[PDB]
């Protein structure tokens, strides 16, 4: 079994490098963020441009959806996160507290909380309703590259240029685990598996690893792509075959068989680094996005 992703749409409109693309949990929408300070919303199935959401004073590195698909949070170089009402485009809350660029953000499954990671080396936990910062974790000793809640939100995984991946107890802020590796290249990306048992970690030595969280053990390695420079998103594709999906600094989307670790597909089309990829929640649809020689988002669909 191999996928057969084919190009469906190319979405143009951002005026600088695109930073992050995410499908709404209800599958209806794609949100994108960019160095151009804008969020844009697009129909997931027809690629139709819906609206632009603006307000950040500097470039945006990440965006994330609430569980009901009604809210977005964005993380910006302006040191803030913003919570947006997607239907109105209005900024509901500006989340202030970070002392440097906000790099990464996610809601928890209940979506009463938001977690953020910053160049200021901290992880913050925010109350969605009030916009107040509930906890500041002294998480790392370099910029925080990624933050992600597990399946029920009880845990937070973070990664950093300090070479570490740490797991945090959401309720107490306490560190449950630091992943044990003999070496410490920058960790550029981390995410829980959908069942919360595994962690997918990227390092800037062209390497993705699947870690068993309970055992503290590396189970799988995925290679062949280029990743030495940028914090590139990776994914679990679960709708058809069980794949790992990543962007690449050679302008390609890479798809691996999760279990065998074989490259099953490489998607060509982009004309710059593929910084971000996202997997649709119910269909075999990938969204990919690229840096400033390109500035487009591509939507791809497979039979499996």
């Amino acid at each position: 079994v191999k996928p057969n992703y084919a190009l469906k749409f190319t979405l143009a409109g951002h005026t600088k490098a695109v930073s992050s693309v995410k499908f709404s949990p209800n599958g209806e929408w794609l949100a994108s963020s960019s160095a151009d300070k804008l969020i844009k919303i697009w129909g997931a199935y027809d690629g139709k441009f819906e609206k632009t959401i603006s307000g950040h004073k500097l470039g945006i590195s990440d965006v994330a959806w609430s569980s009901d698909s009604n809210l977005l949070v964005s993380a910006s170089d302006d040191k803030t996160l913003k919570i947006w009402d997607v239907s109105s485009g209005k900024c509901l809350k500006t989340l202030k507290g970070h002392s440097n660029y906000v790099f990464c953000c996610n809601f928890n499954p209940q979506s009463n909380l938001i977690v953020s990671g910053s160049f200021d080396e901290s992880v913050r936990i925010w109350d969605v309703k009030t916009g107040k910062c509930l906890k500041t974790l002294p998480a790392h000793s370099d910029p925080v590259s990624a933050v992600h809640f597990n399946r029920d939100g009880s845990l937070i995984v973070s990664s950093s240029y300090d070479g570490l991946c740490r797991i945090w107890d959401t309720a107490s802020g306490q560190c449950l685990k630091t992943l044990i590796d003999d070496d410490n290249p920058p960790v550029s990306f981390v995410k829980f598996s959908p069942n919360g048992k595994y962690i997918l970690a990227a390092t800037l030595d062209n390497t993705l690893k699947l870690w068993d969280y309970s055992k503290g053990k590396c189970l799988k390695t995925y290679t062949g792509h280029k990743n030495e420079k940028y914090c590139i998103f990776a994914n679990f594709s679960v709708t058809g075959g069980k794949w790992i999906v990543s962007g690449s600094e050679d302008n390609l989307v890479y798809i691996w068989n999760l279990q065998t670790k074989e490259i099953v597909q490489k998607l060509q089309g982009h004309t710059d680094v593929v910084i971000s990829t996202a997997c649709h929640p119910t269909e075999n649809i990938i969204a990919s996005a690229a840096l400033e020689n390109d500035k487009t988002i591509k939507l791809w669909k497979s039979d499996c």
Partner: peptide, 6 residues
């Protein structure tokens, strides 16, 4: 931003 290498 994430679009510049750091």
């Amino acid at each position: 931003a994430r679009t510049k290498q750091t």
